[PDB]
Amino acid sequence: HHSSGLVPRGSHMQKVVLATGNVGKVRELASLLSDFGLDIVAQTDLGVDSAEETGLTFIENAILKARHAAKVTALPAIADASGLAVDVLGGAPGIYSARYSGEDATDQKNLQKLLETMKDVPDDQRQARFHCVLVYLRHAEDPTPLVCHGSWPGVITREPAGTGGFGYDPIFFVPSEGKTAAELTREEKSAISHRGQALKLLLDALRN
Amino acid sequence: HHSSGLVPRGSHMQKVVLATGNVGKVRELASLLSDFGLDIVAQTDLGVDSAEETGLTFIENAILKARHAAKVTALPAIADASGLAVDVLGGAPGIYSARYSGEDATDQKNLQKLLETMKDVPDDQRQARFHCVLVYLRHAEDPTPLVCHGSWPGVITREPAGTGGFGYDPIFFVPSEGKTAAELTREEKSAISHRGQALKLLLDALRN
Numbered sequence A, B: 001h002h003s004s005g006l007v008p009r010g011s012h013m014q015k016v017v018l019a020t021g022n023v024g025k026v027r028e029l030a031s032l033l034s035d036f037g038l039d040i041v042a043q044t045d046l047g048v049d050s051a052e053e054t055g056l057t058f059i060e061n062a063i064l065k066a067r068h069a070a071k072v073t074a075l076p077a078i079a080d081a082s083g084l085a086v087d088v089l090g091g092a093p094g095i096y097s098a099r100y101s102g103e104d105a106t107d108q109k110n111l112q113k114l115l116e117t118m119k120d121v122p123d124d125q126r127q128a129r130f131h132c133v134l135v136y137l138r139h140a141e142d143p144t145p146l147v148c149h150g151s152w153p154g155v156i157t158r159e160p161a162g163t164g165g166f167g168y169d170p171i172f173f174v175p176s177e178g179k180t181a182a183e184l185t186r187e188e189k190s191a192i193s194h195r196g197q198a199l200k201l202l203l204d205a206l207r208n
């Protein structure tokens, strides 16, 4: 159902390091988990450097990141790992999503490379999902982290459309919405995305 | 919901290597998945040697094993990782379940060591679960394996009772049954165990 030590029992807060220094992600999560008694703090506030993302799956990377933060802070740790996985490319860009076009990758060059890679893919074989894996480790050596995996299916376009969001959003067409992820508003994207799903799953698993 | 390539579509069979040479596990799984069109084969039939279990979680080990088999056979791969996690010991024996008492570990010496480790644990603080994590990788570099995690709660006894099963069964008391895992029959244990749960989850995720 999932074991003890994920929430405090329980007038006090439990401090939990989030494995990012990203203030937006930290604000979002601290705000959601607040009510469960979790005091969420960026790993950067506690002097944690970036972990080397050496895993070959989102789950392995999320766990590696969470473990590094927990090991350096001696706190329980939450991490995420996210990316785009294209069926016809066996799940690529996958764990190489952020760095797909190499050293000096940028969002645009990443997406442009994905279009080039997919230029001869038939129109009906362009399925893809964004994935967000969240993990929660009680301590660095916890053998049974909670793991929350959200995903969001779409289809890769042939040209970019829209300027909202980030990353591959301009080429990720969402047939249920009749537009790309970058044409959605932030509120509209948040309601349906892989990250929205994984947060819902997490909040719901901590209820429990 | 979970992506393509886990079942064939679909008069043919898809061969899938199970990451064990254990004939009982292979018979059980081949028999369950048969109907879904999966042709399950022990990794030992295909000449796969044991992978080094280097991960610090059941999920990391199950994935490592599945990836090694898939990489050596070029087949999709299923693996499991299982063990006993005791709350008061932070999840130990955990990934060291099979080897808990070291080099030349046996079931009995493992369990006897767990009793010694837990001898001063109050009677009401002896919670534990067995965990079984099953994973299914489409190929060695698949970034989004299916992951099925079953667990089974119990309480660690102060003495062994019963001679059925294996491993820590003689000291894992199951309050809903009023006996230890080793006092259950094989059919009774199978119906409720961490492995029973993970198989149910897998069979149900392949339905889908």
Ligand SMILES: O=c1[nH]cnc2c1ncn2[C@@H]1O[C@H](COP(=O)(O)O)[C@@H](O)[C@H]1O
Pocket: A080, A081, A082, A083, A084, A097, A098, A099, A110, A130, A165, A166, A167, A168, A169, A181, A193
């Ligand atoms: O919502 C999203 N839209 C577009 N691309 C994303 C999204 N989430 C993850 N990605 C891609 O996956 C990478 C994930 O790295 P992270 O954002 O560092 O976790 C990002 O750099 C993007 O390349």
Ligand SMILES: O=c1[nH]cnc2c1ncn2[C@@H]1O[C@H](COP(=O)(O)O)[C@@H](O)[C@H]1O
Pocket: B080, B081, B082, B083, B084, B097, B098, B099, B110, B130, B165, B166, B167, B168, B169, B181, B193
């Ligand atoms: O059903 C069970 N009963 C008792 N111990 C188990 C069970 N499943 C896993 N274990 C323990 O966890 C280890 C798991 O290793 P595996 O059986 O090699 O997957 C076993 O050697 C036992 O030590």
